[PDB]
Scaffold this active site. Structure first.
Site, PDB file in Angstrom:
ATOM      1  N   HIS B  42       0.789  -1.226   0.000  1.00 26.41           N
ATOM      2  CA  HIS B  42       0.000   0.000   0.000  1.00 26.41           C
ATOM      3  C   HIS B  42       0.831   1.290   0.000  1.00 26.41           C
ATOM      4  CE1 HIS B  42       0.069  -1.077   4.277  1.00 26.41           C
ATOM      5  NE2 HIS B  42      -0.314  -2.297   3.818  1.00 26.41           N
ATOM      6  N   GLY B 144       3.095   6.167  10.445  1.00 25.91           N
ATOM      7  CA  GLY B 144       4.415   6.058   9.825  1.00 25.91           C
ATOM      8  C   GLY B 144       5.164   4.784  10.213  1.00 25.91           C
ATOM      9  N   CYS B 146       4.279   1.523   9.527  1.00 25.40           N
ATOM     10  CA  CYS B 146       4.111   0.378   8.637  1.00 25.40           C
ATOM     11  C   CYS B 146       5.427   0.020   7.954  1.00 25.40           C
ATOM     12  CB  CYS B 146       3.054   0.659   7.561  1.00 25.40           C
ATOM     13  SG  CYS B 146       1.383   0.625   8.279  1.00 25.40           S
TER      14      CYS B 146
END
Ligand SMILES: *[C@@](O)(c1nc2ccccc2s1)[C@H](C[C@@H]1CCNC1=O)NC(=O)[C@H](CC(C)C)NC(=O)c1cc2c(OC)cccc2[nH]1
Ligand SMILES: *[C@@](O)(c1nc2ccccc2s1)[C@H](C[C@@H]1CCNC1=O)NC(=O)[C@H](CC(C)C)NC(=O)c1cc2c(OC)cccc2[nH]1
Lengths: 301, 302
Positions: B42, B144, B146
């Protein structure tokens, strides 16, 4: 979201760990630039350990008596000196993995990360506080001496602890990197007791703020207290006094939650007086005192 | 004893693999091993893509030149890209010189691991996590985070087991293995997803009772046993996870160390569940701990 004891990333410190052997004693050392720092009692045999006269024991050693290994590479010892309870071994090789660093003496109530090592090899990393009685509640086994404690600020490693001792109660004692003990402890093979410990009030307050940030609010109340009234109760329960500087340091957490510091004090007073009545905060049945306000902010944005 | 504490593995071998991956203004963490960078897929999403992304379609529009991979401020050139489940694999033109010995492992519920929480490719801290029975983790992760990973280290080999993707409504966390397969029923979209009801990790509570015995705290031992099936049916009544044969087997070293058969310890736990603690404590606590595994206990006792 979420709230865990968090250590600093340990890689900068891992690249400095070595093994130091004198006779059949082996412990860990810290290799920075061209010097290896380690506990002085690497020089002791079992017969020395009760009543070591360290100046006498050291003068009986030369350079070639110390085996320093970085992994499976021997570093040649070209000089040695003793500073308090630390030995400093000058080697012929600079460590290119040396980070920017400082040696600091930490204050009671401050936290730091420990890199537990055995045979010069890092094993685990965890966060500890310097207790008010100058012990640390670490996790250290035989062979752990010379493991270090540190904080990281930007890219700079502040070394604050070197491990030397486990007390009969199972807490730990050690020195700063100048080799001066925290607390009334001595590097000899004797059973040593600490002073009575107290709880680090400012850190409990920080952790109650963490709890509110993470939606755990059952312990809040509409009441307030004065700073001196709170301190009288804290002292009665073997909690450290809260200073105006501590109130100041808690200001950002107070702002973030909308709970005034003296209102949080009133909540804590009620917990001390009443207990938790089988309830938990952030999953804990106990009030946690090993997160500083800094540590909470770092984790809670 | 010293007390048990959550201890993480030293994080240096993982620090030496962290990079940032940016597409547009969206930056996630990635993991650089050999000549491949792994990150959540993503990173290719715009805000408008995120409720229901067609990742196959979104990726067709991306070229190698749309990915900015950096180690610190230094760009790492992308020379290929593919998607595997919910992760992107970016082939890069430089093999990471800090690549450790490594494996990709898919862990079971109950297993613990260390998380190196990172933001913009830069590590903030390291902590120990358990995979809950409902395939969530009680992590600590901000915007932030991920692409931060979870791992174990065994004799200098890093076993990577988790990459971070999501915070559920309840505040717990969800993610994938390093092949990009979610743990649990979760999907990588901007939707509120519920986990199953969580249960207590029985194998780890049994490890904790073994740890208590090792440390001389053994009031709860009885002279009885149970069958595994009878124990699992009682366990369920108390919202404890049923034991598997693997659980029985990983308790083998503690059973050997103490001489207490696994099924005898199960009988002791059953009695605790049915009768309660009755004012007593174990290892200093009125609560039973469930995030120390059999391996963790032996590590801290030795
Ligand atoms: C450390 O690893 C060292 N071990 C040795 C061994 C030979 C020479 C020098 C050293 S330093 C070790 C760390 C301890 C072991 C168990 N967990 C720990 O944290 N430190 C010691 O063993 C230390 C050595 C002193 C010479 C500094 N001694 C003790 O911690 C100690 C001695 C006693 C004791 O003696 C009668 C009674 C009760 C408690 C106790 N602790
Ligand atoms: C992760 O850091 C990522 N952020 C971005 C931003 C743009 C593109 C891709 C990604 S991945 C982030 C980590 C979360 C933030 C707060 N704590 C964390 O652990 N993950 C997400 O933001 C994630 C992105 C999905 C596309 C996988 N979304 C959720 O975690 C999410 C979405 C919802 C929600 O949507 C309506 C409702 C409730 C809960 C929820 N969580």
């Amino acid at each position: 979201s979420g709230f865990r004891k968090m250590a600093f990333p340990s890689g900068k410190v891992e690249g400095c760990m070595v093994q130091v052997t004198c006779g059949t004693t082996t412990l860990n050392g810290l290799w920075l630039d061209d010097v290896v720092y380690c506990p002085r009692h690497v020089i002791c045999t079992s017969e020395d350990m009760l009543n070591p006269n360290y100046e006498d024991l050291l003068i009986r050693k030369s350079n070639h008596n110390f085996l320093v290994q970085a992994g499976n590479v021997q570093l040649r010892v070209i000089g040695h000196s003793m500073q308090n309870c630390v030995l400093k071994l000058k080697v012929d090789t600079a460590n290119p993995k040396t980070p920017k660093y400082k040696f600091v003496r930490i204050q009671p109530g401050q936290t730091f990360s420990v890199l537990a090592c055995y045979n010069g090899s890092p094993s685990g990393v965890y966060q500890c506080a310097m207790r008010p009685n100058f012990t640390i509640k670490g996790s250290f086994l035989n062979g752990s001496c010379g493991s270090v404690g540190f904080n990281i600020d930007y890219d700079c490693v502040s070394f604050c602890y070197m491990h030397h001792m486990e007390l009969p109660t199972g807490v730990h004692a050690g020195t700063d990197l100048e080799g001066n003990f925290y607390g009334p402890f001595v590097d000899r093979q004797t059973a040593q007791a600490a002073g009575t410990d107290t709880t680090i009030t400012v850190n409990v307050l920080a952790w109650l703020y963490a709890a509110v940030i993470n939606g755990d609010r059952w312990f809040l109340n509409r009441f307030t207290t004065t700073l001196n009234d709170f301190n009288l109760v804290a002292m009665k329960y073997n909690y450290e006094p809260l200073t105006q500087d501590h109130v100041d340091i808690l200001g950002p957490l107070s702002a973030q939650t909308g709970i005034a510091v003296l209102d949080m004090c009133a909540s804590l007073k009620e917990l001390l007086q009443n207990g938790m009545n089988g309830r938990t905060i952030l999953g804990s049945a106990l009030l946690e005192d090993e997160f500083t306000p800094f540590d909470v902010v770092r984790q809670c944005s």
